[PDB]
């Protein structure tokens, strides 16, 4: 069934599972035409497919060329997401295929289910968690590779860098979702916090800075404070 606060630790057992987030698959800018009507222009997007136990990220880049000549793009985006996730599963060796796929938006259930008819033993699940994965395009290196792409392209990353050498999956995911929540609520402040200190660099093969353990505590505290502040401002509490 659905994924919630109660069955949260299931994410970190040894049953392979992936999260799929489609919020950045179909991205547009809205602008005014010469005659004063509104039009959209698509920009490149991506499917955010993540194994929360291992950190492996399967970033599938969605090139604007996919939309050319198509109607009902927002609907089509869901089907293209499910098509590409299915192809990813097919491309993986049997022992690496997931036992569950957890979609972050309920509208993805039917498209994925239909595309996964060949994999009846892979369970497609919704979630009640309010996961922040839409902010994945606030991670500079991910945004950069998406925006530069000239063709459909799959790019692999570990979204935990090397954290798992020192902490558990559970702790890694809480850090990741805290960082993304912060970047979602106030990107400018979130990014300030991460880079303020120029003596803490991001390795060429990483996405986040090379914080020491103590520095991560300070960071995480700083991201929590950011999040709670923005809440008071949102609601006047």
């Amino acid at each position: 069934g659905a994924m919630n606060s109660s069955n949260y630790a299931e994410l970190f057992n040894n049953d392979i599972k992936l999260f799929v987030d489609d919020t950045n698959v179909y991205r547009v800018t809205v602008h005014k035409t010469f005659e004063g009507n509104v039009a959209t222009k698509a920009i490149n997007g991506c499917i955010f497919t993540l194994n929360p136990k291992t950190g492996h990220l399967f970033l599938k880049i969605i090139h604007t060329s996919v939309w050319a000549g198509q109607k009902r793009l927002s609907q089509l985006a869901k089907w293209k997401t499910a098509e590409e996730v299915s192809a990813l599963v097919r491309s993986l060796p049997k022992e690496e295929q997931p036992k569950q796929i957890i979609v972050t938006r309920k509208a993805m259930l039917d498209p994925l289910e239909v595309h996964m008819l060949d994999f009846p033993n892979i369970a497609i699940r919704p979630t009640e968690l309010r996961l922040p994965f839409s902010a994945a395009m606030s991670i500079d290196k991910l945004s950069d590779v998406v925006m530069k792409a000239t063709e459909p392209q799959m790019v692999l990353f570990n979204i935990y860098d090397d954290w798992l050498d020192r902490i558990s999956s559970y702790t890694a995911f809480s850090r990741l979702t805290l960082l993304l929540r912060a970047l979602k609520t106030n990107e400018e402040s979130a990014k300030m916090i991460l880079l303020s200190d120029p003596t803490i660099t991001i390795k060429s093969y990483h996405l986040w800075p090379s914080f020491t353990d103590e520095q991560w505590i300070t960071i995480e505290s700083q991201m929590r404070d950011l999040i709670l502040t923005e809440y008071g401002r949102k609601y006047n509490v």
């Binding site: 089509l76 089907w79 039917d110 498209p111 239909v114 008819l117 060949d118």
Partner: protein
């Protein structure tokens, strides 16, 4: 005009024949139904005064034999049987009439209701849905389950309706996932009409039979089957025009005939609101839409 005699009526029971029904009191001298119109299927059904659970009944066609009803005190229910001795049977029928102990199938001559509800229902197809090949008539009751229900336990007692499932390999061609799931025309016309049912009359016949079982026995799997076959059509962009027009007539008489007090369990909100207002054929069910709005606007 044909006759179905009853040996006796030992327990208090409500007896239906098609859309008509009569209360019969314990050991009231009731001995059959006469003047039953030849040319259509029929159903004679029961609900004991003591157990408003388990409505049950028998589909039959009088052209296929001489049938009669006999209460069984071991199994506790009215059983349909066949009399093979043609002479012995006209003898019972004629003596019971002479004594005038038989009710008359009470058809108004203006009324096409039963024809309209059973236009495409054929006994031969019923006996494939209700497989019991040593009887010419078919038993159904409230609690019988369908083959699909069983898949998600006793197969001898199953309603073997055609399995329809919108999220199946059958329904979805590989490579046309999105196309076929949003436009079931493929599934309807090639898989189901041309493939399994062969023509629209067999399809309509199963749809009508499912509705009738839902209505007369409250058989829930039949209600599911009836809704699924409507939805398959309403969710197909490409439907022969002869089918759409006939469908409007079929559903009209089905909605017209339903007991008003039952619309809550027998009518699936989602399917009807999707068929009448969201689907490809939203504009092709004018009579069905007009009667639904003027009788059950709540459900919509």
């Amino acid at each position: 005009m044909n006759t179905v005699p009853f040996t006796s009526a030992p327990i208090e029971v409500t007896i239906g024949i098609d859309q008509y029904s009569f209360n019969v009191k314990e050991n009231q001298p009731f001995h059959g139904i006469k003047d039953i119109p030849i040319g259509h299927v029929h159903v004679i059904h029961f609900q004991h005064a003591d157990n408003s659970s388990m409505r049950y009944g028998y589909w039959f066609d009088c052209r296929m034999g001489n049938f009669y009803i006999q209460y069984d005190p071991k199994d506790g229910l009215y059983k349909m049987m066949e009399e093979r001795d043609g002479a012995k049977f006209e003898n019972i029928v004629h003596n019971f009439k002479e004594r005038q102990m038989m009710v008359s199938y009470p058809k108004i001559d203006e009324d096409d209701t039963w024809y309209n509800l059973t236009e495409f229902v054929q006994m031969d197809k019923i006996r494939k849905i209700v497989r019991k090949d040593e009887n010419q008539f078919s038993y159904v009751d409230s609690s019988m389950t369908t083959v699909q229900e069983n898949e998600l336990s006793d197969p001898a007692h199953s309603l073997n309706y055609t399995v329809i499932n919108f999220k199946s390999r059958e329904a979805i061609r590989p490579g046309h996932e999105m196309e076929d799931f949003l436009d079931k025309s493929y599934y309807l016309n090639t898989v189901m009409l041309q493939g399994i049912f062969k023509n629209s009359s067999n399809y309509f016949g199963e749809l009508q039979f499912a509705f009738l079982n839902a209505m007369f026995f409250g058989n829930y799997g039949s209600s599911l089957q009836w809704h699924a076959m409507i939805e398959l059509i309403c969710s197909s962009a490409t439907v022969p025009k002869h089918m759409l027009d006939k469908l409007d007539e079929i559903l009209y008489y089905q909605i017209k005939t339903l007991p008003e007090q039952y619309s809550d369990i027998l009518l699936n909100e989602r399917v009807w609101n999707i068929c009448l207002y969201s689907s490809f054929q939203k504009n092709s069910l004018h009579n069905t839409e007009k009667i639904m709005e003027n009788k059950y606007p709540e459900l919509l």
